[PDB]
Amino acid sequence: EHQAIAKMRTMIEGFDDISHGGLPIGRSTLVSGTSGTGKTLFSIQFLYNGIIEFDEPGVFVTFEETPQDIIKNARSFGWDLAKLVDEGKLFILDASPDPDLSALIERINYAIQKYRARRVSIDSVTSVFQDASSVVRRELFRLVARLKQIGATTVMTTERIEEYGPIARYGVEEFVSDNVVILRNVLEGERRRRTLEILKLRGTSHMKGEYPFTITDHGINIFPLGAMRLTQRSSNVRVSSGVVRLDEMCGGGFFKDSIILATGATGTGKTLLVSRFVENACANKERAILFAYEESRAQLLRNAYSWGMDFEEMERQNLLKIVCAYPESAGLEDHLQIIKSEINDFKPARIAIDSLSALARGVSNNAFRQFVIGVTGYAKQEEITGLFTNTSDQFMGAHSITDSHISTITDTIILLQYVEIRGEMSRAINVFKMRGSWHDKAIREFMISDKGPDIKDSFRNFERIISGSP
Amino acid sequence: IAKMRTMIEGFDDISHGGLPIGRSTLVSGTSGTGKTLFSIQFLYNGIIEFDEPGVFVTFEETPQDIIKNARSFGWDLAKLVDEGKLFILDASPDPELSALIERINYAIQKYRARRVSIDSVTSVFQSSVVRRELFRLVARLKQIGATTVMTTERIEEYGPIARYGVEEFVSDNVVILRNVLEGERRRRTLEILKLRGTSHMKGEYPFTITDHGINIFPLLTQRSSNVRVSSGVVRLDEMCGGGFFKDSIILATGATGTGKTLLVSRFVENACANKERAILFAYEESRAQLLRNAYSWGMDFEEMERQNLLKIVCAYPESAGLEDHLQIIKSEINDFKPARIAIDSLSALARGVSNNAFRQFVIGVTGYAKQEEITGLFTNTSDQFMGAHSITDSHISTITDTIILLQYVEIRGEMSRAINVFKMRGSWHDKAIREFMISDKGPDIKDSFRNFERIISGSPTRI
Amino acid sequence: EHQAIAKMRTMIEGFDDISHGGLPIGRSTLVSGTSGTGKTLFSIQFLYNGIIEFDEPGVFVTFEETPQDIIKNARSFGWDLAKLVDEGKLFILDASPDDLSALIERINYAIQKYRARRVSIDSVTSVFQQDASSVVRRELFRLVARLKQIGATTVMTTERIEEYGPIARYGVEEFVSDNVVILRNVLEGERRRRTLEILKLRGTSHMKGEYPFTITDHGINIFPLGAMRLTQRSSNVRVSSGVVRLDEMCGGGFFKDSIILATGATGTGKTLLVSRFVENACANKERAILFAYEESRAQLLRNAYSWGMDFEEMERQNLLKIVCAYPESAGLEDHLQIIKSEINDFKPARIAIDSLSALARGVSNNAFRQFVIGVTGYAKQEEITGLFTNTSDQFMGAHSITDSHISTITDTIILLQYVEIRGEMSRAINVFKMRGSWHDKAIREFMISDKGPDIKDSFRIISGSPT
Numbered sequence A: 001e002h003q004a005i006a007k008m009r010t011m012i013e014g015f016d017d018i019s020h021g022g023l024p025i026g027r028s029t030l031v032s033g034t035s036g037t038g039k040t041l042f043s044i045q046f047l048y049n050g051i052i053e054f055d056e057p058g059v060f061v062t063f064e065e066t067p068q069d070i071i072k073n074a075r076s077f078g079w080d081l082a083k084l085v086d087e088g089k090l091f092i093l094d095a096s097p098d099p100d101l102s103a104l105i106e107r108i109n110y111a112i113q114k115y116r117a118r119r120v121s122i123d124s125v126t127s128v129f130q131d132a133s134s135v136v137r138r139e140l141f142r143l144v145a146r147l148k149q150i151g152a153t154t155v156m157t158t159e160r161i162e163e164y165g166p167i168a169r170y171g172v173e174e175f176v177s178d179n180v181v182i183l184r185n186v187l188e189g190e191r192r193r194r195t196l197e198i199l200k201l202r203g204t205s206h207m208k209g210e211y212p213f214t215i216t217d218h219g220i221n222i223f224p225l226g227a228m229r230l231t232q233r234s235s236n237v238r239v240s241s242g243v244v245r246l247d248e249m250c251g252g253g254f255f256k257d258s259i260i261l262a263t264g265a266t267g268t269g270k271t272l273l274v275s276r277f278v279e280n281a282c283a284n285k286e287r288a289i290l291f292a293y294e295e296s297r298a299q300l301l302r303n304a305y306s307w308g309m310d311f312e313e314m315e316r317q318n319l320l321k322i323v324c325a326y327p328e329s330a331g332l333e334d335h336l337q338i339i340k341s342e343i344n345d346f347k348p349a350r351i352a353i354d355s356l357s358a359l360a361r362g363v364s365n366n367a368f369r370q371f372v373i374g375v376t377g378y379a380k381q382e383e384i385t386g387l388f389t390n391t392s393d394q395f396m397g398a399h400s401i402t403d404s405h406i407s408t409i410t411d412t413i414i415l416l417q418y419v420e421i422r423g424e425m426s427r428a429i430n431v432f433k434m435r436g437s438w439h440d441k442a443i444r445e446f447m448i449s450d451k452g453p454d455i456k457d458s459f460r461n462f463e464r465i466i467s468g469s470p
Numbered sequence B: 001i002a003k004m005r006t007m008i009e010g011f012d013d014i015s016h017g018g019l020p021i022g023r024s025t026l027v028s029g030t031s032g033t034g035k036t037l038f039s040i041q042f043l044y045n046g047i048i049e050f051d052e053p054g055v056f057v058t059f060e061e062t063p064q065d066i067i068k069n070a071r072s073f074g075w076d077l078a079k080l081v082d083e084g085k086l087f088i089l090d091a092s093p094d095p096e097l098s099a100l101i102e103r104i105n106y107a108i109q110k111y112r113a114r115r116v117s118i119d120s121v122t123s124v125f126q127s128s129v130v131r132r133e134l135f136r137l138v139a140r141l142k143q144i145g146a147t148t149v150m151t152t153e154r155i156e157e158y159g160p161i162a163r164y165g166v167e168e169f170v171s172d173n174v175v176i177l178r179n180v181l182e183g184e185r186r187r188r189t190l191e192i193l194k195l196r197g198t199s200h201m202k203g204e205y206p207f208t209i210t211d212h213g214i215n216i217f218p219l220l221t222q223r224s225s226n227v228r229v230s231s232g233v234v235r236l237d238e239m240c241g242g243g244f245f246k247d248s249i250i251l252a253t254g255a256t257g258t259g260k261t262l263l264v265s266r267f268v269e270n271a272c273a274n275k276e277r278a279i280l281f282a283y284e285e286s287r288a289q290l291l292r293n294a295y296s297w298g299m300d301f302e303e304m305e306r307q308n309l310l311k312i313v314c315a316y317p318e319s320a321g322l323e324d325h326l327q328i329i330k331s332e333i334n335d336f337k338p339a340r341i342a343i344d345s346l347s348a349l350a351r352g353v354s355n356n357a358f359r360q361f362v363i364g365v366t367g368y369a370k371q372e373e374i375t376g377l378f379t380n381t382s383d384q385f386m387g388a389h390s391i392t393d394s395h396i397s398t399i400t401d402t403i404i405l406l407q408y409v410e411i412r413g414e415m416s417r418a419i420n421v422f423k424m425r426g427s428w429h430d431k432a433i434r435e436f437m438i439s440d441k442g443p444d445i446k447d448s449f450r451n452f453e454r455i456i457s458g459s460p461t462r463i
Numbered sequence C: 001e002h003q004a005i006a007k008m009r010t011m012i013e014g015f016d017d018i019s020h021g022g023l024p025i026g027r028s029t030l031v032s033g034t035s036g037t038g039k040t041l042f043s044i045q046f047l048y049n050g051i052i053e054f055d056e057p058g059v060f061v062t063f064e065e066t067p068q069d070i071i072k073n074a075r076s077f078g079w080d081l082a083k084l085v086d087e088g089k090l091f092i093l094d095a096s097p098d099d100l101s102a103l104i105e106r107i108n109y110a111i112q113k114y115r116a117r118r119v120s121i122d123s124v125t126s127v128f129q130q131d132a133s134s135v136v137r138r139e140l141f142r143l144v145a146r147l148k149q150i151g152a153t154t155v156m157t158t159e160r161i162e163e164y165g166p167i168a169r170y171g172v173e174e175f176v177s178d179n180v181v182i183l184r185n186v187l188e189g190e191r192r193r194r195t196l197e198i199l200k201l202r203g204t205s206h207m208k209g210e211y212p213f214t215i216t217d218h219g220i221n222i223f224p225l226g227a228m229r230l231t232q233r234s235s236n237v238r239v240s241s242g243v244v245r246l247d248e249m250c251g252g253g254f255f256k257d258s259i260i261l262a263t264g265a266t267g268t269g270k271t272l273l274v275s276r277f278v279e280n281a282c283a284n285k286e287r288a289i290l291f292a293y294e295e296s297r298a299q300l301l302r303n304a305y306s307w308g309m310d311f312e313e314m315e316r317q318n319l320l321k322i323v324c325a326y327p328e329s330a331g332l333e334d335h336l337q338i339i340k341s342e343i344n345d346f347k348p349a350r351i352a353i354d355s356l357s358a359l360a361r362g363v364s365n366n367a368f369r370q371f372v373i374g375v376t377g378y379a380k381q382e383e384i385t386g387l388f389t390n391t392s393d394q395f396m397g398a399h400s401i402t403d404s405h406i407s408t409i410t411d412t413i414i415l416l417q418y419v420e421i422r423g424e425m426s427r428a429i430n431v432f433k434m435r436g437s438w439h440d441k442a443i444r445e446f447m448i449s450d451k452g453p454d455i456k457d458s459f460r461i462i463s464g465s466p467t
């Protein structure tokens, strides 16, 4: 026309959706972060993807690492650079020391037009000036300007010392570059959280703020929070809960494309509903994943066997997959990526998390919510009926279903609670709510035996039941 | 002191007329705050409104770059630059002081302009040395009689205003653009620190960068009548005594699964049939689940949308900041012109934000549906079912005109619901807790809860 | 303390009370500020007030701003420096670059040339932006000492980078001078609160801490929220509330010199009690102001009529004035300013605020209390019956009267509450107390209709769910 900026798709999982296309063409993009944020990896993926996807020859300019180390390091992510160097599709410009700007611009311009390279990656300019906050501005501006005329899209790596200090080392590089990306490795308590951020994109629009990401065997995996987004398919289909009495209490089964949440005090029978729930899928030749977060695979099996359920059988048949882990063993972003990886490989019909309350421990209520949105959102988009557990910190203290306030993110709510009746400790199941279906509104009493849960009749001749002592 | 209007949506209000004429205005901020976009909107608007010539001095960027990025919003920087209306004086050093001021005055005259935009004065000095040099620039510029905009750069978001700590004391007018990190979410605000010799609005104001450039949001002149509209529930209309006032803010509150998302359905529909337009801003449920559920209750949102008498939005509250959300609801109410508006829910947009930020949001939204005579039903889920003592956890009860209380009542091992009209500003309403049930048709309010005491607690004791 | 130091009257609203007389005579005063805090506007209002109210000739020394702009700016408030200069009463001794002993010589020349008593320099910093801590200290000393010898009460302006960092830009000026004032512009979560403080007055006493102030069309307006009075002036004169049945429970209406507070949950009748309180004023031929922060003039008059009250007419008689505002527009300091200014241009018999709770939203508990003591102490100091409203965050089980703890600053409390009676939400009014009068120590029923309140017969109704 023109009426915008043409972008260059990076092919990095999530980055194209945040930048709304990729990296502005011909312009230089600054990618600064602390040590081990994924700067070197970002610039490599930028080139590797450009060649493997579009045959856009790339140039990589290293200052510390050796060309042989750049290739051996890239080996972990399972991509062969030595094969691309030989094909004349990738060239590693070794501008490193050994046991001024003019000389470099030359070599970079020599290798660009030699390989018809459309993509370039410098890592990391900073190490070069290692002077004066003014000198770095001029020397940097010179490089950025000289690279602009060539019409080559560059990715400049910059080092940092603080997670929230100045954007770049000298507090100047940010204004020189047209596009700025910040890679963070923030420390919560003792867990590291990876966040990528597009600060500015001179010309075009983008998504603002930090976005969680992970470094896996596939490289950088970003997760656009609300991209995009609240547009998952919803069917009026029904699925069994594993309990006939609960099937009826919910208007004849659960609901394919729904999030179920069983809440209650400790030992109310949450892991039972989960056991019967996962076993039902396997009694229909359907796959199911049970994400255990508070019981060993050995205990779940022995407890399920006392309820008349053979988890080992469903496992030998490859219908049931148990994934146990410590919530504190990793970050909430890692758990999400782990879960998403499991659903893609195993491709199950039902999912269960025992429990959500355990993942919400020693974490911000905001970080936990963004997690529940990711798990529930991903499950709804794939029409994977998910059942989430939640333990009440309080026993016989009503108020709110959850202390995390995830009631509005759930579609169905099964409320389990203790009830002191005649110096005994009875239990009461209840379908608090069910979106898109009629549901039983009775506070039914249920028992637990070797034959699972026997849902009996409600307490008609009782007031103040919800109090836990009527 | 006379001020020339900028036409930057909201800035003229905060500045009370615009920018002090014949005086330099400093605009400092961090990277990607809008310092450069601010200066371009200054010359552009000043022209495409008043044909007032304008000059632009660059130090890092290239004229080709300015014109290139100048598009994005669809600004003919090409024609204007060539039409003789605008001129871009380069000044960047070759890749491989007094002359500047001389090249500038010659430019101001050679084009006959009263709007200049320097950017950036920091790129240069690369602060006792910057104090004098910056003094001379701003000084000689006051004589030329030009209203300047000098862009500066900052490192910290709440630290110094400029780089060296003088730029502010040299300039007469200071504006601060910010990009504060609101826990993973970015909130850009504009504040006028000082306007020598004139009054302005103190403090920071939230703004957003969009296709129409910048849209700053400043902040009780409304207007109401006695005209009443339906709620979709014939009875609920009887409990309110004719229904809801055309120009009013309604609030349905209760625990989860009480029937607030239902009422929102009937409310949006009472407009669909009446041949009126209704917008639904959903933040909890997906379009698909709503429609499916919308149908499981009778109403057919699929058809109501085809007749162009309804607009379902759908968005994550965590997708953007409160400011961004407000700008959507707004830019969405002006490109549809609806009679009433529904929000499901307020508790959703309150999540992961400060009570202060949320309140500033609920006011701005409400402060709109009013200055536009639009019916506004807002939903709110109480994170306390049974034994709750408050209409809202965010305390927004004294910002709404009507309130619908939905609560759970345990009547002998039975989870029963109870609707009520807690209040109704400037009307009679039924002041009794009515038991209601939900079917495949919608709500059905029955007799009250007589023969029971302490219904409020949620576990009453029959008399 | 036998003989105290003679102080120069500033005539800057509130400053003379904080300083205990004004600026010590013969000594220079440092006014450190953070850019746009009001360092210049203070140095001008200092000379101006001297020239206009004491014939005290003034000399304003500029180091950056042109004498033109200095004057051009003053017109903003309605001052005419151009005139006061043509008379040789004031002199803008320009010193803006295109030393040391030069400026001093020029100074003493003007002081004696104009017999000037007040001097103001703005600023002794941009003069150094063209040094080292060791230099400025001795440089700043040479200036002060010389002025102390001339015997001219000076006001030297200084710049600050941080709001709570060093006093001056070098950490020296704070000690060279005898008197130090700190003008702050602190960011209180998006809203700006400017406060004045006297860090030290060598040889005399003063009020310590920060004092909130505003910059308006009448210059700097400080509020010494601390010591003033509490001498007051009260009477046994009664005032009707416009309900009749309430005036009875109050022992014959409210006291003319008293603070009335109407507390209750939302939709209780706090706004209705204000209407009835206002109509009574327009009937007794008395001017009344209404500060509505929740509803707009439109919604008020419309809601007022529904209660059989012509708010539209009451104003058509220049007897009622509705001041609709937003608590989120400005800060408390800015509200207290608009409220006072409003009372001084109308001089009403009674004012009603709807509501205190709306103004206590997003502000600290101490900043609010300060504001309440402000409007309360002011409404009382002018013998004006003030009625304040306060919404309760919770209903049925309210532990206390107010969540902000404002009850002990009120004299009369009108407690409103919801009462559940057999699946029916009923209302109950009560006079919780009355400073120096008998009141109906009983919670009575209460209904609202086309008219207004109708206090029915009396009746644990406190829990909101009686038995």
Ligand SMILES: Nc1ncnc2c1ncn2[C@@H]1O[C@H](COP(=O)(O)OP(=O)(O)OP(=O)(O)O)[C@@H](O)[C@H]1O
Pocket: A033, A034, A035, A036, A037, A038, A039, A040, A041, A042, A076, A077, A159, A215, A216, A217
């Ligand atoms: N196969 C892999 N699986 C998971 N993580 C990996 C894998 N390979 C590398 N990593 C992680 O990626 C990081 C390497 O990122 P990269 O070298 O790009 O960081 P950087 O920001 O450039 O660091 P520096 O500035 O110190 O050079 C390591 O910290 C390592 O934990």
Ligand SMILES: Nc1ncnc2c1ncn2[C@@H]1O[C@H](COP(=O)(O)OP(=O)(O)OP(=O)(O)O)[C@@H](O)[C@H]1O
Pocket: A264, A265, A266, A267, A268, A269, A270, A271, A272, A273, A306, A307, A391, A448, A449, A450
């Ligand atoms: N074979 C059995 N016979 C009878 N009751 C049993 C049997 N097995 C388990 N239970 C009961 O079930 C309870 C445990 O059920 P479950 O593990 O589902 O509880 P939960 O809600 O998941 O608790 P937690 O959150 O502590 O893990 C025990 O407290 C016990 O009362």
Ligand SMILES: Nc1ncnc2c1ncn2[C@@H]1O[C@H](COP(=O)(O)OP(=O)(O)OP(=O)(O)O)[C@@H](O)[C@H]1O
Pocket: A174, A175, A176, A199, A200, A201, A202, A203, A204, A205, A206, B029, B030, B031, B032, B033, B034, B035, B036, B037, B038, B072, B073, B153, B209, B210, B211
């Ligand atoms: N068409 C568009 N729609 C929405 N947002 C846009 C559009 N074009 C640009 N933007 C955003 O507006 C911002 C304006 O950047 P601007 O050049 O004003 O920053 P700056 O403060 O000058 O930065 P620096 O200090 O580094 O020069 C960009 O960062 C970009 O994110």
Ligand SMILES: Nc1ncnc2c1ncn2[C@@H]1O[C@H](COP(=O)(O)OP(=O)(O)OP(=O)(O)O)[C@@H](O)[C@H]1O
Pocket: B168, B169, B170, B193, B194, B195, B196, B197, B198, B199, B200, C033, C034, C035, C036, C037, C038, C039, C040, C041, C042, C076, C077, C159, C215, C216, C217
């Ligand atoms: N007529 C007016 N009415 C209301 N407010 C005004 C008026 N004129 C100026 N102001 C306000 O008062 C301020 C004036 O303060 P002043 O110019 O004294 O700042 P300062 O502390 O001297 O700043 P600097 O250190 O940069 O010189 C302006 O920022 C403006 O907000």
Ligand SMILES: Nc1ncnc2c1ncn2[C@@H]1O[C@H](COP(=O)(O)OP(=O)(O)OP(=O)(O)O)[C@@H](O)[C@H]1O
Pocket: A407, A408, A410, A432, A433, A434, A435, A436, A437, A438, A439, B254, B255, B256, B257, B258, B259, B260, B261, B262, B263, B284, B296, B297, B381, B438, B439, B440
């Ligand atoms: N077809 C139906 N028949 C009977 N009951 C139904 C039917 N559809 C829905 N319901 C009931 O009505 C409720 C609908 O909840 P709704 O979404 O209206 O309320 P909400 O408080 O807004 O919910 P949430 O907190 O999830 O946003 C469910 O709890 C369910 O029990």
Ligand SMILES: Nc1ncnc2c1ncn2[C@@H]1O[C@H](COP(=O)(O)OP(=O)(O)OP(=O)(O)O)[C@@H](O)[C@H]1O
Pocket: B397, B398, B422, B423, B424, B425, B426, B427, B428, B429, C264, C265, C266, C267, C268, C269, C270, C271, C272, C273, C294, C306, C307, C391, C448, C449, C450
């Ligand atoms: N014309 C009328 N006829 C009967 N009852 C009415 C009428 N107008 C209002 N009401 C009742 O009185 C209430 C109005 O009282 P008022 O406006 O003083 O409440 P409030 O305590 O100020 O509440 P808020 O602080 O939420 O505005 C309404 O909620 C309604 O119940």
Ligand SMILES: [Mg+2]
Pocket: A039, A040, A041, A123
């Ligand atoms: Mg690296």
Ligand SMILES: [Mg+2]
Pocket: A270, A271, A294, A354, A355
């Ligand atoms: Mg368990």
Ligand SMILES: [Mg+2]
Pocket: B035, B036, B119, B120
């Ligand atoms: Mg710029």
Ligand SMILES: [Mg+2]
Pocket: B261, B284, B285, B344
């Ligand atoms: Mg809902």
Ligand SMILES: [Mg+2]
Pocket: C039, C040, C122, C123, C157
């Ligand atoms: Mg000044």
Ligand SMILES: [Mg+2]
Pocket: C270, C271, C294
């Ligand atoms: Mg009211």
